[PDB]
Amino acid sequence: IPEEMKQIVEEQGNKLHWAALLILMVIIPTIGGNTLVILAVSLEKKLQYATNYFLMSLAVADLLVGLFVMPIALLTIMFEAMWPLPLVLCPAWLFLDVLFSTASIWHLCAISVDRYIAIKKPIQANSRATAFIKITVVWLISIGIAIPVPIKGIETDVDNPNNITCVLTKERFGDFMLFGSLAGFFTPLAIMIVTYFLTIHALQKKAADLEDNWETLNDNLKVIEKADNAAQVKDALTKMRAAALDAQKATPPDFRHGFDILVGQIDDALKLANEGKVKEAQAAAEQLKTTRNAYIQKYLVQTISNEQRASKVLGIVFFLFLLMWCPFFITNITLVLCDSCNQTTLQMLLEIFVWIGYVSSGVNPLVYTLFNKTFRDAFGRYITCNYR
Numbered sequence: 001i002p003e004e005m006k007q008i009v010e011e012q013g014n015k016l017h018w019a020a021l022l023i024l025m026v027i028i029p030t031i032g033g034n035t036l037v038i039l040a041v042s043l044e045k046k047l048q049y050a051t052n053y054f055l056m057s058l059a060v061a062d063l064l065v066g067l068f069v070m071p072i073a074l075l076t077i078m079f080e081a082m083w084p085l086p087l088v089l090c091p092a093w094l095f096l097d098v099l100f101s102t103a104s105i106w107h108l109c110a111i112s113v114d115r116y117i118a119i120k121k122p123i124q125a126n127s128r129a130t131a132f133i134k135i136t137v138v139w140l141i142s143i144g145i146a147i148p149v150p151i152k153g154i155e156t157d158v159d160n161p162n163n164i165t166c167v168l169t170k171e172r173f174g175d176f177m178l179f180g181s182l183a184g185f186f187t188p189l190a191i192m193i194v195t196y197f198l199t200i201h202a203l204q205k206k207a208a209d210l211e212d213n214w215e216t217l218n219d220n221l222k223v224i225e226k227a228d229n230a231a232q233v234k235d236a237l238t239k240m241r242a243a244a245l246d247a248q249k250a251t252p253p254d255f256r257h258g259f260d261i262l263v264g265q266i267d268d269a270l271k272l273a274n275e276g277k278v279k280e281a282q283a284a285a286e287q288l289k290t291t292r293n294a295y296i297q298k299y300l301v302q303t304i305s306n307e308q309r310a311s312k313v314l315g316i317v318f319f320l321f322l323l324m325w326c327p328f329f330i331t332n333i334t335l336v337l338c339d340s341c342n343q344t345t346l347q348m349l350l351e352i353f354v355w356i357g358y359v360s361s362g363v364n365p366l367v368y369t370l371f372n373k374t375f376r377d378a379f380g381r382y383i384t385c386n387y388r
């Protein structure tokens with residue numbers, strides 16, 4: 001039917017405006033936004049340490065996406081029918097695509113776990129070797145999920161060697177489009193949900209112990225004040241010392257120093273109590289209050305509010321990262337799991353959602369680092385080409 005053949009002639013139209021849109025809105029902000037973070041970690045000597053190395057690994061992964069994956073994925077937009085590049089590049093590009101796309105997700109998952117354990121066990125920290133182990137393991141996972149695509153390969157015809165037409169066929173790669181999405185997306189998703197609620201419980205548990213310490217400390221002061229006996233000053237001071245140390249152990253090693261001072265005073269106080277002079281010791285315990293006010297009280301709200309806000313913004317940005325991948329993977333999963341649905345339009349939907357996921361992974365590290373003043377005014381000097 002010529003009235004339909006002409007319609008397919010219109011279907012294979014010109015789609016340069018969409019390609020220009022993707023260059024302007026996604027690829028350029030990806031390469032630039034990631035090179036900014038890499039420059040920030042590389043140049044700023046004050047930014048160099050354990051966590052930023054992992055963050056830089058993530059930025060490298062996303063930069064590699066925006067450098068090798070997306071420009072070829074464009075050529076597929078324009079040259080819709082047949083794969084233009086050589087035959088080897090179809091498994092090469094697909095492998096790189098899955099590899100990096102998985103690497104970003106698992107990077108975020110590992111960062112979530114780290115940010116949680118840092119709240120749980122703050123005193124147990126995080127060398128360079130730890131970060132190296134983490135980078136290696138994450139990239140090993142990404143390779144392990146990505147390797148079936150180059151191992152299996154794209155079907156070829158002895159008749160038509162040229163017409164490869166790169167696509168993950170449902171018939172050929174069905175199990176991979178299922179279990180690869182399960183191992184690559186939904187598993188770290190569930191992990192991050194678990195660590196989310198665990199982080200809520202961890203923060204709410206840390207906040208209570210600080211209050212108990214506070215009025216543990218405050219109560220015993222009242223005990224020292226009304227102490228007619230000598231022994232109790234030793235007991236009250238001992239328990240105040242324990243409470244002070246316990247409260248100080250909630251933060252990695254400046255109101256925190258006020259605990260050291262406090263303990264010191266307490267020691268001297270229970271020296272007088274050990275000498276017998278209770279009336280002279282209670283007089284110094286009556287001025288433990290100055291240290292208790294100038295440092296401890298301001299320390300309590302600072303820790304809580306800081307960890308609260310940081311975990312909050314981290315949760316939000318990570319949630320918005322994972323939200324923009326959902327269409328791709330729910331479409332990819334159902335595409336396997338539906339013999340009733342139309343496969344053609346279901347493939348077009350993937351061909352659109354890939355760019356939502358692409359822009360989600362591309363701008364993620366920059367967005368995450370922009371909530372840090374040091375990174376911000378490093379970027380400001382970089383976009384003004386000032387450097388150092």
Ligand SMILES: CC(C)CCC[C@@H](C)[C@H]1CC[C@H]2[C@@H]3CC=C4C[C@@H](O)CC[C@]4(C)[C@H]3CC[C@]12C
Pocket residue numbers: 023027028029031032035382383385
């Ligand atoms: C050809 C299409 C894909 C667009 C071209 C992309 C490249 C060449 C462009 C797009 C955005 C550009 C980057 C934008 C931001 C910076 C920060 C600056 O401190 C160094 C240059 C650098 C890193 C630019 C280098 C060139 C750049 C990466």
Ligand SMILES: CC[C@@H](CO)NC(=O)[C@@H]1C=C2c3cccc4c3c(cn4C)C[C@H]2N(C)C1
Pocket residue numbers: 097098101102145166167168169176177180181183184185350351354357
């Ligand atoms: C729409 C054009 C088609 C052509 O077949 N391209 C794809 O389907 C690519 C395949 C992907 C994939 C498949 C299976 C598991 C996966 C992934 C990814 C990560 N994980 C864990 C990345 C995702 N890529 C971005 C797109």
